[PDB]
Design a protein around this motif. Structure first.
Motif, mmCIF file in Angstrom:
data_model
loop_
_atom_site.group_PDB
_atom_site.id
_atom_site.type_symbol
_atom_site.label_atom_id
_atom_site.label_comp_id
_atom_site.label_asym_id
_atom_site.label_seq_id
_atom_site.Cartn_x
_atom_site.Cartn_y
_atom_site.Cartn_z
ATOM 1 N N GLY A 43 0.836 -1.199 0.000
ATOM 2 C CA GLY A 43 0.000 0.000 0.000
ATOM 3 C C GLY A 43 0.879 1.261 0.000
ATOM 4 O O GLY A 43 0.903 2.021 -0.960
ATOM 5 N N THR A 44 1.673 1.479 1.061
ATOM 6 C CA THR A 44 2.601 2.606 1.059
ATOM 7 C C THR A 44 3.806 2.359 0.157
ATOM 8 O O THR A 44 4.463 3.286 -0.316
ATOM 9 N N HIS A 45 4.183 1.086 -0.007
ATOM 10 C CA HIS A 45 5.338 0.692 -0.784
ATOM 11 C C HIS A 45 6.618 1.246 -0.171
ATOM 12 O O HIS A 45 7.623 1.386 -0.848
ATOM 13 N N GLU A 46 6.605 1.412 1.152
ATOM 14 C CA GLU A 46 7.814 1.837 1.846
ATOM 15 C C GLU A 46 8.590 0.646 2.422
ATOM 16 O O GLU A 46 8.082 -0.488 2.449
ATOM 17 N N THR A 47 9.882 0.841 2.735
ATOM 18 C CA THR A 47 10.752 -0.193 3.262
ATOM 19 C C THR A 47 11.266 0.302 4.604
ATOM 20 O O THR A 47 11.699 1.467 4.706
ATOM 21 N N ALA A 48 11.190 -0.547 5.634
ATOM 22 C CA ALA A 48 11.921 -0.333 6.876
ATOM 23 C C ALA A 48 12.625 -1.636 7.260
ATOM 24 O O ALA A 48 12.344 -2.737 6.744
ATOM 25 N N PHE A 49 13.555 -1.560 8.233
ATOM 26 C CA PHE A 49 14.286 -2.729 8.661
ATOM 27 C C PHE A 49 13.752 -3.090 10.044
ATOM 28 O O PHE A 49 13.706 -2.268 10.954
ATOM 29 N N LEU A 50 13.304 -4.329 10.181
ATOM 30 C CA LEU A 50 12.669 -4.755 11.420
ATOM 31 C C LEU A 50 13.196 -6.119 11.823
ATOM 32 O O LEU A 50 13.672 -6.935 11.028
ATOM 33 N N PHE A 91 4.625 -10.564 12.355
ATOM 34 C CA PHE A 91 3.546 -11.511 12.683
ATOM 35 C C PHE A 91 3.173 -12.281 11.414
ATOM 36 O O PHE A 91 2.669 -11.663 10.476
ATOM 37 N N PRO A 92 3.337 -13.601 11.353
ATOM 38 C CA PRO A 92 3.046 -14.334 10.102
ATOM 39 C C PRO A 92 1.610 -14.077 9.684
ATOM 40 O O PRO A 92 0.645 -14.037 10.443
ATOM 41 N N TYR A 93 1.384 -13.800 8.363
ATOM 42 C CA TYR A 93 0.112 -13.305 7.877
ATOM 43 C C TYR A 93 -1.069 -14.286 8.045
ATOM 44 O O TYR A 93 -2.111 -13.811 8.440
ATOM 45 N N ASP A 94 -0.821 -15.560 7.770
ATOM 46 C CA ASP A 94 -1.906 -16.569 7.853
ATOM 47 C C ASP A 94 -2.521 -16.611 9.259
ATOM 48 O O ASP A 94 -3.715 -16.327 9.392
ATOM 49 N N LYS A 95 -1.639 -16.742 10.259
ATOM 50 C CA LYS A 95 -2.069 -16.820 11.658
ATOM 51 C C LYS A 95 -2.754 -15.530 12.092
ATOM 52 O O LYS A 95 -3.671 -15.588 12.912
ATOM 53 N N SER A 96 -2.336 -14.356 11.570
ATOM 54 C CA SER A 96 -2.664 -13.053 12.110
ATOM 55 C C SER A 96 -3.775 -12.287 11.384
ATOM 56 O O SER A 96 -4.198 -11.216 11.840
ATOM 57 N N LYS A 97 -4.177 -12.784 10.207
ATOM 58 C CA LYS A 97 -5.031 -11.980 9.347
ATOM 59 C C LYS A 97 -6.433 -11.747 9.915
ATOM 60 O O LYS A 97 -7.021 -10.682 9.710
ATOM 61 N N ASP A 98 -6.917 -12.718 10.700
ATOM 62 C CA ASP A 98 -8.226 -12.588 11.335
ATOM 63 C C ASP A 98 -8.253 -11.413 12.318
ATOM 64 O O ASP A 98 -9.274 -10.769 12.510
ATOM 65 N N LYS A 99 -7.120 -11.122 12.962
ATOM 66 C CA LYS A 99 -7.037 -10.031 13.902
ATOM 67 C C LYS A 99 -6.661 -8.716 13.246
ATOM 68 O O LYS A 99 -7.136 -7.663 13.656
ATOM 69 N N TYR A 100 -5.715 -8.751 12.282
ATOM 70 C CA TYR A 100 -5.110 -7.510 11.819
ATOM 71 C C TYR A 100 -5.561 -7.094 10.406
ATOM 72 O O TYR A 100 -5.360 -5.945 10.041
ATOM 73 N N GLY A 101 -6.251 -7.995 9.703
ATOM 74 C CA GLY A 101 -6.601 -7.792 8.288
ATOM 75 C C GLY A 101 -7.983 -7.150 8.133
ATOM 76 O O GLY A 101 -8.846 -7.740 7.525
ATOM 77 N N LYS A 102 -8.187 -6.010 8.767
ATOM 78 C CA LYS A 102 -9.453 -5.298 8.682
ATOM 79 C C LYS A 102 -9.147 -3.890 8.183
ATOM 80 O O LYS A 102 -8.066 -3.351 8.403
ATOM 81 N N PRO A 103 -10.075 -3.197 7.468
ATOM 82 C CA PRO A 103 -9.749 -1.859 6.968
ATOM 83 C C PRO A 103 -9.379 -0.856 8.042
ATOM 84 O O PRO A 103 -9.848 -0.969 9.177
ATOM 85 N N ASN A 104 -8.557 0.113 7.660
ATOM 86 C CA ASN A 104 -8.033 1.097 8.582
ATOM 87 C C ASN A 104 -8.005 2.400 7.802
ATOM 88 O O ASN A 104 -7.796 2.413 6.587
ATOM 89 N N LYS A 105 -8.232 3.495 8.515
ATOM 90 C CA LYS A 105 -8.301 4.801 7.898
ATOM 91 C C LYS A 105 -6.937 5.263 7.390
ATOM 92 O O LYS A 105 -6.867 6.206 6.604
ATOM 93 N N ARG A 106 -5.832 4.627 7.816
ATOM 94 C CA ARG A 106 -4.529 5.199 7.513
ATOM 95 C C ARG A 106 -4.189 5.085 6.025
ATOM 96 O O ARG A 106 -4.543 4.086 5.391
ATOM 97 N N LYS A 107 -3.475 6.100 5.523
ATOM 98 C CA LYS A 107 -3.077 6.225 4.129
ATOM 99 C C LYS A 107 -2.385 4.937 3.684
ATOM 100 O O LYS A 107 -1.357 4.557 4.253
ATOM 101 N N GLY A 108 -2.948 4.315 2.642
ATOM 102 C CA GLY A 108 -2.289 3.194 1.981
ATOM 103 C C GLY A 108 -2.707 1.853 2.571
ATOM 104 O O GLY A 108 -2.400 0.838 1.954
#
Length: 93
Positions: A46-53, A59-76
């Motif tokens: 969405g933002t297409h930005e890169t950071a180092f973490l 958080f692996p996406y499959d396990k986490s998507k039910d909690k974190y994969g909901k729309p958000n007002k933030r840009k991108g």
């Protein structure tokens, strides 16, 4: 059992001040700047930005998507939700 993170893995990545964000572990192109030790290059959908973490913020996406994969007002963010679900391995350069 889990392996270590590798390029192409899909995650939600956490940055201070931002919601857990759809992202991938990127590869490092030949000639490109390398991350610090114990850090991964994270491309944020969405933002297409890169950071180092490090793993503590990944958080692996499959396990986490039910909690974190909901729309958000933030840009991108909602663009990023589409990308990680529909074409998470494309070039977004």
């Amino acid at each position: 059992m889990p392996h270590a993170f590798k390029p192409g893995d899909l995650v939600f990545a956490k940055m201070k001040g931002y919601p857990h964000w759809p992202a991938r572990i990127d590869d490092i192109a030949d000639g490109a700047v390398k991350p610090p030790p114990n850090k991964y290059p994270i491309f944020f959908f969405g933002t297409h930005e890169t950071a180092f973490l490090g793993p503590k913020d990944l958080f692996p996406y499959d396990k986490s998507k039910d909690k974190y994969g909901k729309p958000n007002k933030r840009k991108g963010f909602n663009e990023g939700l589409w990308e990680i679900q529909n074409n998470p391995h494309a070039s977004y350069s």
